[PDB]
Amino acid sequence: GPHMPTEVILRGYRNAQHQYAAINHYEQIAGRICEDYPREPPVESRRYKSELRDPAFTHRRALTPEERAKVNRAMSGEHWVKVTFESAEAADKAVYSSPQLIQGHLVYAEYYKGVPPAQDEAIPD
């Protein structure tokens, strides 16, 4: 069925330096995450961050209007991040798979319900 971008909270990782691992792992197991967050550890620099979208400056995937609207609703804390899966099916896989063990922490995936998590906290396994 037609892809409808679907927002999910990923939460419980050790600290903000572990956000990349939550995103990489859940993207790999569930499907594309539309945000341009890092998927590599911040142990050393890898890539320049740019918010340009002009194709004279980037040939990275152009977001659809529906994807862009949700990606622009950026939300995160120290131990959580809101992501936009490209489809409802991907979001459902993430939620079914939750929690996942990521660098010694249980990282939960929950549908976004209009509010941030009440607690911004790590969940050591």
From Swiss-Prot:
Location(s), subcellular: Nucleus, Nuclear pore complex; Nucleus membrane
Subunit: Component of the nuclear pore complex (NPC). NPC constitutes the exclusive means of nucleocytoplasmic transport. NPCs allow the passive diffusion of ions and small molecules and the active, nuclear transport receptor-mediated bidirectional transport of macromolecules such as proteins, RNAs, ribonucleoparticles (RNPs), and ribosomal subunits across the nuclear envelope. Due to its 8-fold rotational symmetry, all subunits are present with 8 copies or multiples thereof. Part of a tetrameric NUP192-NUP170-NIC96-NUP53 or NUP188-NUP170-NIC96-NUP53 module.
Domain notes: Contains FG repeats. FG repeats are interaction sites for karyopherins (importins, exportins) and form probably an affinity gradient, guiding the transport proteins unidirectionally with their cargo through the NPC. FG repeat regions are highly flexible and lack ordered secondary structure. The overall conservation of FG repeats regarding exact sequence, spacing, and repeat unit length is limited. FG repeat types and their physico-chemical environment change across the NPC from the nucleoplasmic to the cytoplasmic side.
Function, as annotated: Functions as a component of the nuclear pore complex (NPC). NPC components, collectively referred to as nucleoporins (NUPs), can play the role of both NPC structural components and of docking or interaction partners for transiently associated nuclear transport factors. Active directional transport is assured by both, a Phe-Gly (FG) repeat affinity gradient for these transport factors across the NPC and a transport cofactor concentration gradient across the nuclear envelope (GSP1 and GSP2 GTPases associated predominantly with GTP in the nucleus, with GDP in the cytoplasm).
The protein, known as: Nucleoporin NUP53
Top-level taxonomy: Eukaryota, Fungi, Dikarya, Ascomycota, Pezizomycotina
Gene: NUP53
Residues of the full protein shown: 133 to 253 of 426
